[model samples]
Target: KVFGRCELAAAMKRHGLDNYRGYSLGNWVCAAKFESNFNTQATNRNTDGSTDYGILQINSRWWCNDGRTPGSRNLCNIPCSALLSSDITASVNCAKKIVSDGNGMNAWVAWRNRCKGTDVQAWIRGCRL
Candidate 1:
C-alpha cells in the first residue's frame, strides 16, 4: 500500500520552500496527477521507443541510459525507483533542474499548462513557466 500521507505532507512541506511558485505548494502534485495519476510506480512506453517511469513519469532514456534497468539513476541520486520511494521531491526537483535550471514548481506550472484541461497533447508543450 501507499505510505503515510502525513509523512508525505511533511516531506512536501519541507520541500515546499524550494517550489518556485512562491506561495503555492501543490503544483508538483498537480503535475504528478496530470502525468501519472499520482501513481508513484507508473511506467509508459512511447512510440518512439522511449520509456517513462515512476512518479513524475521521468523518461528512462533521458535519466537512465544504462538500458532496461528499472531503478537506475541518471543525473540524480541512487535510482529512479529510489527517487520514487525514498523521496518524490528529490526526483521532481531533479527533473526541474534538468529542465529549467533551478526553477522547480514554476517549471511544473509551465508543464501543467500543456497537459491539463482540454485539448492537451505532448508532455509539456504549451507551458508558461
Candidate 2:
C-alpha cells in the first residue's frame, strides 16, 4: 500500500520509529520519501547482489534473509519479504537494529544523502503525530 505523508507519520510513530536513537521522526520521513516514496512494496537491487526491500529499503546483505545476498548475515532474523508489507512493524524493528549496529542513519544511503543534509524538520511539518 502507498501511504500519504501524514498517515506514514502516524504509522511510523506507532511502530516506535519516532525519535529512535536520537534521529527524529522527520528524518525517517525524509528517508522513506526518497527511498521508496512511501510505497510498502518497494524494492531495489544493489550492484553487490543484495536487494533492498520496503519503505526504508532494508538490505538483504545484512538485515533480512532473501536467500540471494552473498554471505548475508540476516541479522534482523526475518524474511526480506516481511519488509514489503504495509504493516511496517518489521521495517521499524529492523531499522532500529541497523542504527543500533553503529551505523546510525548512515546505514541507509538514502537517509545519509537525502535526509541527513536537509532540514528534516520541514519534512514532517503539518503532520500531526
Candidate 3:
C-alpha cells in the first residue's frame, strides 16, 4: 500500500507509534516520508549489502532476516518479506521493538537526517491528528 501522509499517520498511531518512546507522530510521519515515501514494498540495498525493507525501511542486517545479509541478527524474528506487505503489522511490531531494544528513533537513518529535531508537524500539516 502506498499510504498518503495522513493515512500513514493514522496507521502508525493504530500501531502505537505516536509518541512511542518519546518520538512524536510527526517524527514517525517524516521518517516514513524520507525513508520509503510510505511505500510498503520499498527496498534499498546499502553499500555494505544489507537491505532495508518496507515503509519504515527496517534494516535486514539487524532486524529482519532476509536470508542474504551476512551475519543477520533476525532480532525481529521475521522474514524481511513480511515488512513489504501492505498489512504493515509485522513492520510496526518490529519498529516498536527496535526502539525498545534501545535503538530509539535513531534506528532509522532517515529519521535522524530528516525528521530529528525538525518541526515534523509540517510533514503532516493537512493530516488531522
lDDT, candidate 2, equals 0.91
Q: Which has the greatest TM-score?
A: 2
Best candidate according to lDDT: 2
Q: List runs of model 3 lying over 4 Å from the truth.
A: none
Task: Return the lDDT, model 1, position 86.
Answer: 52
Error of 1 at 75 (Å): 3.0
Q: Cα-based RMSD of the predictions, in order? A: 8.0, 0.9, 1.2
- Model 1 pairs whose backbones collide: 110-127, 110-129
- After superposing candidate 1 on the true structure, give the runs of residues whose Cα lies further than 4 Å from its correct spot: 1-10, 16-18, 21-23, 69-73, 102-110, 113-129
Cα lDDT listed for each candidate: 0.52, 0.91, 0.89
How many angstroms is residue 84 displaced in model 1 relative to the true structure, after the best TM-score fit?
3.2
Model 2 ranges with Cα > 4 A deviation: none
